[PDB]
Amino acid sequence: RLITEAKQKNQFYCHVNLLVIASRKFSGDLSDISKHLALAITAMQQGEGVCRIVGVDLAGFENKETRASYYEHDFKAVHRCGLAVTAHAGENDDPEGIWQAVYSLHARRLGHALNLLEAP
Amino acid sequence: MSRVLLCSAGHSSMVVPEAFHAVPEGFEEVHVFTTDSEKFNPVVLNDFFHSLPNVRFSITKCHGLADILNERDFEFYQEMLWQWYLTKMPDNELPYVCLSGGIKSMSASLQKAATLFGAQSVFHVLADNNPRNIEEMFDALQKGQIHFIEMGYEPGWAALRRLKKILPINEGCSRDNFKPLISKSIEEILSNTGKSNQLPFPSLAILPPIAQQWLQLPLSANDGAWIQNLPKVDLHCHLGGFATSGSLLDQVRGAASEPDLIDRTFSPQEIAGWPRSHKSISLDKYMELGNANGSKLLKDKGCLIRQVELLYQSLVNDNVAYAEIRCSPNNYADKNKNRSAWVVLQDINDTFTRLITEAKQKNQFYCHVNLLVIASRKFSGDLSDISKHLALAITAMQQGEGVCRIVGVDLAGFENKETRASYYEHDFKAVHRCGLAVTAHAGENDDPEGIWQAVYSLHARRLGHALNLLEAPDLMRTVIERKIGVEMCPYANYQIKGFAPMPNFSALYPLKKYLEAGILVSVNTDNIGISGANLSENLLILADLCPGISRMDVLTIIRNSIETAFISHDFRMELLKFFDRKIYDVCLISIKN
Amino acid sequence: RLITEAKQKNQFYCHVNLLVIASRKFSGDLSDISKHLALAITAMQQGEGVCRIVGVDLAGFENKETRASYYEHDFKAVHRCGLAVTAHAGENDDPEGIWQAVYSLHARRLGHALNLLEAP
Ligand SMILES: [Mg+2]
């Protein structure tokens, strides 16, 4: 509604898309990730409307043994259905974690990762 | 260094002597165009210029016309004036041209001609008293009454000059036979963000707007010269198919170390109309046509070196600035002469390195070449050869130092579903971890699922052929968003599958769709010798395979080819810089023809 | 060259073959193991020469951090080309480590393992 109203005034507007973030909860119930992702695959199917869902965020791992390949069983779906993912392998993670994230999650983008220099 | 003065007049015949003194440095050549108006007296200008024999004066009269009255008179005058401007043009330097004489029509036409074909300094003569007697302009010059005004330098277009040879210099003619190529231009200038901001090579924004729209024109068969002069990139080329018949085959055979070990009795069977086949052919005969070469003849080391040198020379001849070659080191190895696959690859690497170094040392045009270790399927074929090839590629990359380098691996051969890419997904872990690149050829006749495994299990950055992608919309979506290049050979697929205008065919080339969708398509040659067509011919044939394609989609294709090559970043910047400068010069000089 | 010189004079000579040791790092540039394996395969592919490459060594810190349950899928490659593999699980190791070094790495030869008495 906001985008349509701004465009009707023919002034300068800002296109905006949402990315549903996976839960940052390793503890508690683990079905939260599944319901979040299944919500995403449904949300992308609205179709109409200037605004859209176009990807998910994979933040939620605490840089511990979780890494990013633990949740890998659940991500064969979003790529098959045409969505996108976004890792957040920043904080304090070794190069191996970013490597396995980018080569199993196949993240089109990547969050932070400031210490990438030490891994040519 | 002589300037040519061009002028025209309808009632003021005396502007030329005034314009003669525009610059105190002295003017050399003056030429005037005028209709058949009986009012004009050339005698006054003749006696004025007889005072300076060093200046050569030409009087050109528009035969059959005295004044513009209607459409036909205007177009006739315009054609003859353009022909005269083309004829009197100095072949090196832009001229000095004035347009004070003549009514608005001739002045505007001369101004448009100058803006098209260029002029060193176009200007206007400002006469306050409009002198009629000979002495008066000299008096004004002494006083300073006569004023000269110019709007600035006007380069015009760089290379449209060989039209004076395209149209022979002929003075005896009429308006019945004129050339509507300038009106064809006029129509093309603004006839048609499909092509506005799709401009690659940001230096492409410097050419005059006539060029900036000329590139948008549909491609034609007569574009061979520009395509040949255009630097190109080939990313899917099989070395085992460069020399297949004729002079190349004779040369490679004669350079063999052991002539007795080769046979000169078998030749591939000719196909009527080859390369433009009238009937689609199966794959088996396509590989059979290359039976004269391959492994039965390339085992010899001298044959290897001769073939590599000949291929490099042909690539340089085709103005190719960068290419990646596909070679099977194991297919040419021979343990009897201690010719291992590694030895073959090392020989090919040193040969290419020496060739490119020699070419660069003389500061000539050199085609940078990188290798591709094809992991031949070998359906059963002692399947450990796959791991052998992977290890060989890994260690070849690990060799490291050098200018010519192995950059990736390719898997192909026996494309049928029995040898799909859903088998060796577990072996490719090491080759991907060490740092190599992956290419997977699949999709000519395979299911729409094998591509998904290839892109998402092997993480292949390039897809061979995949001609049937148009029937899998989700595959289009994922390929487009993941920025996965598609290398695809026009003429080879035309000969194998068949597309319009193939007789008794309805299937159309999915190229144009692949471009407008946004797939990073890169045109390649596959097997030069078997197909009998280089990169230039492959680009040229697109006008028949994909009608309505423009001359700028090929530039976008080449940009995609640069983007999808498994190369380092800094080398990419250097390649883009050199390539865009070269393209700019090529399009500045091209349409001359 | 040395063995050929020794044999040409008809004197006692010592035939020797080389083993490529896959040095254990487990800290950085983990692709070094794959590089070593590829180098060993290409080295044995030389074929000619009385002195050649016959096997690889899985030496290094034989602790639990680098047991045999890590790279067996990559060792499928070296085993495909008919190359012998020598393991080393003899210092500060438990019986199950020796066990799946034998049965997953399929080490045709085993190193050390002094405490094999306690595992009948
Ligand atoms: Mg091919």
- The three-class DSSP label of residue B438 is strand
Cα B167 to the chain's mean position, in Å? 24
Cα–Cα dist A94/C28, whole Å: 9
Residue with the two structure tokens 């079905």: A31
Cα–Cα dist B313/B358, whole Å: 12
- The three-class DSSP label of residue C29 is coil
User: What backbone phi and psi angles, to 5 degrees, belong to C75?
Assistant: -70, -15
* Cβ atoms of B31 and B6 closer than 8 Å: yes
* Cβ atoms of C81 and C47 closer than 8 Å: no
User: What backbone phi and psi angles, to 5 degrees, belong to B345?
Assistant: -65, -40
Chain-chain contact of A103 with B432 (C-beta, under 8 angstroms): yes
Q: How far is A99 from chain B (nearest CA, A)?
A: 9
Q: How far is the CA of B154 from the centre of ligand 1 (A)?
A: 50
Q: Where are the beta strands (DSSP E) in B215-367?
A: 232-238, 320-327
Catalytic residue among C62, C65, C72, C91: C91
Residue with the two structure tokens 């433009």: B276
Interface probe for A, chosen from B449, B458, B482 (most Cβ of A below 10 Å), is B482
Q: How far is the CA of B413 from the centre of ligand 1 (A)?
A: 8
* Burial class of residue A3 (count of CB atoms within 10 Å of its CB; 0-12, 13-18, 19+): middle
- Select from A82, A106, A108 the Cβ nearest to the Cβ of B474: A82
Cα–Cα dist B116/B126, whole Å: 24
Binding-site residue ranges of C for Mg(2+) = 88
Angle between helices C31-44 and B384-399 (to 10 degrees): 110
Indicate the resolution in Å.
3.6
Cα–Cα dist B406/B329, whole Å: 12
C28 interfacial to chain A (CB closer than 8 Å): yes
| Residues of chain A contacting residue B452, judged by C-beta atoms under 8 Å apart | 80
Give the N- to C-terminal CA distance of chain C in Å, as an integer.
Answer: 47
What is the number of residues in chain A? 120
How wide is the angle at C-alpha B73 spanned by C-alphas B67 and B74, nearest 5°? 90
Give the N- to C-terminal CA distance of chain B in Å, as an integer.
Answer: 26
Q: How far is A82 from chain B (nearest CA, A)?
A: 6
Cα–Cα dist B279/B457, whole Å: 37
Amino acid at C66: T
Q: How far is the CA of B306 from the centre of ligand 1 (A)?
A: 22
Q: How far is the CA of B441 from the centre of ligand 1 (A)?
A: 8
Cα–Cα dist B352/B310, whole Å: 11
B343 interfacial to chain C (CB closer than 8 Å): no
- Select from B452, B456, B477 the Cβ nearest to the Cβ of A106: B456
What technique was this entry resolved by?
cryo-EM
Q: Where are the beta strands (DSSP E) in B109-246?
A: 121-126, 147-150, 232-238
Nearest chain C residue to B430 by CA distance is C34
Neighbours of ion ligand 1 (CB under 5 A): B 526
B568 interfacial to chain C (CB closer than 8 Å): no
- The three-class DSSP label of residue B10 is coil
CB pairs < 8 Å spanning A and C: 3
B478 interfacial to chain A (CB closer than 8 Å): yes
Nearest chain B residue to A120 by CA distance is B435
Residue B115: how many CB atoms within 10 A of its CB?
Answer: 16
* Residues of A recognised as catalytic: 91
Burial B464-484 (b: 16+ CB within 10 A, else e): bbbbbbeebeebbebbeebeb
Q: A109 pairs with which residues across the strands?
A: A86
Chain-chain contact of C30 with A119 (C-beta, under 8 angstroms): no
Bridge-based pairing state of the strands B147-150 and B121-126:
antiparallel
Residue A65: how many CB atoms within 10 A of its CB?
Answer: 8
Chains that touch C (3 or more CB pairs under 8 A): A, B
Residues with Cβ within 8 Å of residue B30, at least 6 apart in sequence: B4, B5, B7, B16, B20, B49, B55, B56, B57, B58
